[PDB]
Amino acid sequence: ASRHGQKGTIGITYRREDMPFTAEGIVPDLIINPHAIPSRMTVAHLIECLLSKVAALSGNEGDASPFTDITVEGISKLLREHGYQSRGFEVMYNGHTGKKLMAQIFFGPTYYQRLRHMVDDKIHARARGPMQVLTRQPVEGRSRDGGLRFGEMERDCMIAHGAASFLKERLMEASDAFRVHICGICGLMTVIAKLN
């Protein structure tokens, strides 16, 4: 996730040759979708990319301190002295084609952080599993190889779909299926049955 509000999973790892290449040849370590930004309404992510590029080419450290007077136009002028676009919009060549991309792509140095949450820890799959004895139900959690909870509201979605048997197999065969003998005369399971 970025230092600004936006967070994300990496959908794919792309080799450098595939990734679009500027004339300078810098390949972005990270590619983010444009469509996320306008609804996020965080201009400062864009601002940070611009300021960091200016700072890196100058070598000078760049101050983002809040409530300190900064001109995006001034930073743009500094980028123009560097020769990089005031926008930071960079002409990019599509990697597989070698063709120039029709629309130039924003290219900036963005601070980014690695979130603690990771897939490899998170994933849990249990086809069959240990059962807590009294419930006879699946145990809870990855550590105990536990079965995921089927919500009653989830059950409601299933009823709305109308399939009695999927709900039934999840409800009895998958968890705490049980056979008993109830006495008809008592109406109550007073009966204990020796089958042998």
């Binding site: 996730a1 970025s2 230092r3 600004h4 509000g5 936006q6 967070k7 959908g11 794919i12 792309y14 990734m19 679009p20 810098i26 972005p28 370590d29 990270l30 590619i31 983010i32 979708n33 444009p34 930004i37 996020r40 309404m41 965080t42 201009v43 400062a44 601002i47 940070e48 990319c49 300021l51 960091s52 700072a55 450290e61 760049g62 101050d63 983002a64 301190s65 809040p66 409530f67 300190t68 007077d69 001109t71 995006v72 136009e73 001034g74 960079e90 990019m92 792509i105 924003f106 290219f107 900036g108 140095p109 963005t110 601070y111 980014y112 952080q113 690695r114 979130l115 603690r116 949450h117």
Partner: protein
């Protein structure tokens, strides 16, 4: 900071005390501390009720009397319109918390996303301390090549985030590439 009449009502601390503070800071002679400012009385501690009684100015420059081109990009600032200010706040950034101080430009960004980054940064991996190889904590995560942020708040040098960074300055391009 305390502001009292002299001629024009001016911040009490003045340039000279700052120069002496910086001289003591460079030394690492006459000793200058925050307690010295308080003994001098230039700076005072104000509780919320006392704050209701006081009238304060964000900017030290705003208190000094104002007597025409302005750059368009500069944020529109209402003139304070107030004759007398008891005190002047040291910096707006000081009201912001440490996690807010981390955010590059909260001033240019929406508040909810600032909150979300504050939440994410505690989760974000960084080297916790130099003692870690000696230490045995139950779970620790350390970045392979921690890199200081390219854009730093003035608050961060006090926060020591630059010294123990939690992020990498990845080159980031905003593009549509096969929908991932």
């Amino acid at each position: 900071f305390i502001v009292e009449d002299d001629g024009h009502k001016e911040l009490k601390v003045r340039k000279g005390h700052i120069a002496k503070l910086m001289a003591t800071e460079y030394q690492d002679v006459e000793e200058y501390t925050w307690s010295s400012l308080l003994n001098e009385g230039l700076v005072e501690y104000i509780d919320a009720e006392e704050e209701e009684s006081i009238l304060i100015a964000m900017q030290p420059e705003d208190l000094e009397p104002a007597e025409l081109d302005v750059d368009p990009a500069k944020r529109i600032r209402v003139s304070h319109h107030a004759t007398t200010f008891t005190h002047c706040e040291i910096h707006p950034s000081m009201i912001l918390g440490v996690a807010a101080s981390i955010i590059p430009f909260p001033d240019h960004n929406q508040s909810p996303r600032n909150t979300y980054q504050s939440a994410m940064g505690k989760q974000a991996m960084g080297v916790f301390l130099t003692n870690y190889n000696v230490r045995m904590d139950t779970m620790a995560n350390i970045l392979y090549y921690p890199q200081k942020p390219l854009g730093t708040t003035r608050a961060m040098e006090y926060l020591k985030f630059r010294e123990l960074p939690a992020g990498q300055n990845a080159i980031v391009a905003i593009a549509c590439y096969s929908g991932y």
